[PDB]
């Protein structure tokens, strides 16, 4: 096309500096078929005001094109209303000063999967080229604040697959350059297989004769077990944990020693991850992206962090951690030894119904900050050395004080929380929880009687309305799934995995239809143990439920 404005060209190194840090508009234009098709409503522009006001500098804009094609071979014409909607949203972002990265997203596995046995790699490459030519035509006159990203986490298993991903980068660069406008000088993000650090390192090969300023983008979702709540992993922050994280990132940077690198998506989601672990994890990831000079962009599906209807960040602590790579954060300590028979977290004051109200000492990692003040969610400010003292790295709360919030007999549930202001960094939040062992509506069922769908089991939450994990054992001792978890310690063995096997909502614990299929195929009554926070042992704060067959 023929452009009218000015385009203030910017180097890839400068673009990557200036986006630090970003936020993903997840589950919006990448949702299928349409933008309101999943959990998010139609995209509204106040969202980017919230994002800017939080300290983000850029918005990553995932877009799924799959269901907006009006023609197939040979032209693969994109719905011109979809092209205009994407252009409109980019205008919403850049007009507020936020940099944008727009991509091709869930198309990666919906039609552009090179690893799937019956893929017309010919056809995939044409459609991809036609797609990015039409994208690149519509956006050709966008300013230098808008970058293009080749394709999201493309499936890639072997080195021959990885060579195909390299072609994707080349096809992309050719199409957007044929499109014209300012595209020849637009910052682009090239990708490796799965946007995985090791696959990018193993198989990425820079497009020959590349003329665009470019940067590398990868996604980080490790360690799998803590990030995806697999096999009962609810702690994070040990020497080996931090080492596994720093090594993974360092191996990527060592292989791309002078390349601008964008960490395009990462998240320990507040939905499923314990808060003290999650804050330790985000703090450390931020510490490492500073070390290895990578620009982070947090993944947010709309339920993870910002509530676009209210502007409340569900987890303001992570956002503080991520929006300031130039600050030291004081964090609550927590168990990190997976062989410990009890798990504690200073993100909570816990009190069990029916037990006496005691003093609570919360060990914290101060990191040479000082505690300035504490304010409860009712607006009352606690009196230092009266409602709390600080001994070493321990913050201690007197029983007389805490009993003004809960008693031996008050109802379970979330009481107010305490916000700790420090010398510097984020303000962590300690959540008072009055807890009791939950109770389940049913204690067993026939597999036949509950098939046709998932198993939703009504529950009386008593404290935290969160499922920590679910243990699963056939009547004869064998693990229902994943026998290797027998090396995972007291809180790991025979446990199963969030979303794949279990879930929960405001009123139920859920075993997925997949899990009830495992019980059928095992031909045995198997016992599920639902587990809740606090994880004070492996039995007390748990409820049992067996599945007959
Ligand atoms: O918060 C996590 C939690 O969400 C719970 O879902 C409730 C909520 O979901 C809405 C729709 O979710 C889609 O799944 C999305 C997911 O929400 C999203 O976060 C995820 O992000 C990816 C991203 O795309 C990647 O590029 C990269 O960034 O990794 C992200 C993953 O991040 C994970 O770890 C960090 C956390 O921050 C994240 O929350 C966590 O998810 O993308 C998925 C999309 O999944 C597809 O793309 C990635 C690919 O690898 C997957 O294999 C692929 O999955 C396929 O998706 C198909 C699409 O339709 C299909 O489901 C296939 O079966 C599946 O294999 C769901 O895909 C979509 O169905 C949800 O929309 C609702 O669906 C219900 C019924 O299905 C409808 O009734 C309703 O109208 C829709 O809104 O909002 C609605 C609520 O009902 C959900 O419960 C979820 O239950 C829970 O398990 C967690 O995932
Ligand atoms: C310390 O304590 C304080 C108080 O004691 C805590 O404050 C509480 O913080 C909560 C979250 O931080 C906050 O909840 C939110 O309140 C707002 C304002 O009224 C409300 O809109 C929010 O509801 C959304 O979020 C919840 C998840 O928390 C969703 O389950 C809910 O459905 C809402 O999400 C829907 O709308 C979003 C915006 O559009 C969508 O993105 C989302 O996908 C979902 O969409 C569905 O419904 C839509 C219609 O709503 C529909 O369009 C769509 O298609 C989907 O079907 C949320 O409740 C509390 O308000 C706040 N409490 C108080 C008293 O202030 C604080 O967090 C504590 N701090 C810590 C660290 O623990
Ligand atoms: C760039 O990134 C890569 C990938 O992340 C980094 O390489 C990995 O580094 C880790 C730790 O340094 C290695 O882990 C150890 O590997 C030992 C040997 O692994 C062999 O088996 C692999 C599987 O087939 C094979 O790929 C690998 O080939 C490599 O080494 C050969 C001999 O040293 C050499 O012939 C090849 O050219 C190739 O470089 C090995 O034969 C294993 O025994 C240990 O137990 C441990 O797990 C990974 O294996 C490495 N993966 C690779 C190389 O694919 C690399 O460090 C990064 N570079 C920088 C500068 O940071
Ligand atoms: O599932 C699609 C694609 O994912 C790549 O995995 C990458 C990715 O992880 C994100 C992705 O992980 C899947 O396992 C989950 O099912 C999905 O919900 C989640 O969004 O980014 C970081 C990498 O560590 C990871 O390998 C695969 O590599 C790719 O082959 C393909 O399978
Ligand atoms: C329990 O039954 C399963 C069903 O196949 C079997 O595989 C397993 O061997 C049995 N348990 C033991 C300890 O052998
Ligand atoms: C659950 O069942 C196991 C044995 O099947 C038992 O050891 C454990 O104490 C039970 N716990 C609860 C809370 O029912
Ligand atoms: C874990 O450990 C803490 C102290 O570090 C206790 O307060 C808690 O009850 C649990 O045993």
mmCIF file of C-alpha atoms in Angstrom, residues 151 153-154 156-159 162-163 165-166 169 189-206 214-220 248 251-253 255-256 259-262:
data_model
loop_
_atom_site.group_PDB
_atom_site.id
_atom_site.type_symbol
_atom_site.label_atom_id
_atom_site.label_comp_id
_atom_site.label_asym_id
_atom_site.label_seq_id
_atom_site.Cartn_x
_atom_site.Cartn_y
_atom_site.Cartn_z
ATOM 1 C CA UNK A 151 3.288 -17.725 14.545
ATOM 2 C CA UNK A 153 4.208 -21.836 19.662
ATOM 3 C CA UNK A 154 4.223 -23.833 16.394
ATOM 4 C CA UNK A 156 7.667 -28.955 16.430
ATOM 5 C CA UNK A 157 9.113 -32.303 17.477
ATOM 6 C CA UNK A 158 12.150 -33.055 15.313
ATOM 7 C CA UNK A 159 14.913 -31.165 13.537
ATOM 8 C CA UNK A 162 12.367 -27.227 13.024
ATOM 9 C CA UNK A 163 13.579 -26.607 9.485
ATOM 10 C CA UNK A 165 9.508 -23.568 11.290
ATOM 11 C CA UNK A 166 12.510 -21.741 9.819
ATOM 12 C CA UNK A 169 9.944 -17.281 9.396
ATOM 13 C CA UNK A 189 9.767 -11.401 16.157
ATOM 14 C CA UNK A 190 11.024 -14.686 14.751
ATOM 15 C CA UNK A 191 10.166 -17.943 16.487
ATOM 16 C CA UNK A 192 11.493 -21.430 17.079
ATOM 17 C CA UNK A 193 9.637 -24.682 17.610
ATOM 18 C CA UNK A 194 6.960 -24.424 20.269
ATOM 19 C CA UNK A 195 8.624 -21.144 21.197
ATOM 20 C CA UNK A 196 10.484 -23.517 23.519
ATOM 21 C CA UNK A 197 13.935 -22.389 24.638
ATOM 22 C CA UNK A 198 15.641 -25.723 23.838
ATOM 23 C CA UNK A 199 13.947 -26.259 20.452
ATOM 24 C CA UNK A 200 14.686 -22.677 19.423
ATOM 25 C CA UNK A 201 18.276 -23.233 20.549
ATOM 26 C CA UNK A 202 18.455 -26.599 18.806
ATOM 27 C CA UNK A 203 16.865 -25.721 15.478
ATOM 28 C CA UNK A 204 16.420 -21.959 14.907
ATOM 29 C CA UNK A 205 18.351 -20.662 11.898
ATOM 30 C CA UNK A 206 18.169 -16.938 11.085
ATOM 31 C CA UNK A 214 14.296 -8.652 14.230
ATOM 32 C CA UNK A 215 14.153 -10.135 17.701
ATOM 33 C CA UNK A 216 13.744 -13.643 19.047
ATOM 34 C CA UNK A 217 10.584 -14.537 20.972
ATOM 35 C CA UNK A 218 10.127 -17.545 23.230
ATOM 36 C CA UNK A 219 7.578 -18.643 25.818
ATOM 37 C CA UNK A 220 8.409 -19.908 29.293
ATOM 38 C CA UNK A 248 17.023 -22.847 31.139
ATOM 39 C CA UNK A 251 21.116 -21.789 27.810
ATOM 40 C CA UNK A 252 18.849 -19.767 25.524
ATOM 41 C CA UNK A 253 20.827 -16.543 25.866
ATOM 42 C CA UNK A 255 22.995 -19.681 22.133
ATOM 43 C CA UNK A 256 21.803 -16.229 20.936
ATOM 44 C CA UNK A 259 20.098 -11.172 19.820
ATOM 45 C CA UNK A 260 17.244 -9.086 21.273
ATOM 46 C CA UNK A 261 15.059 -11.601 23.057
ATOM 47 C CA UNK A 262 11.384 -11.215 23.974
#
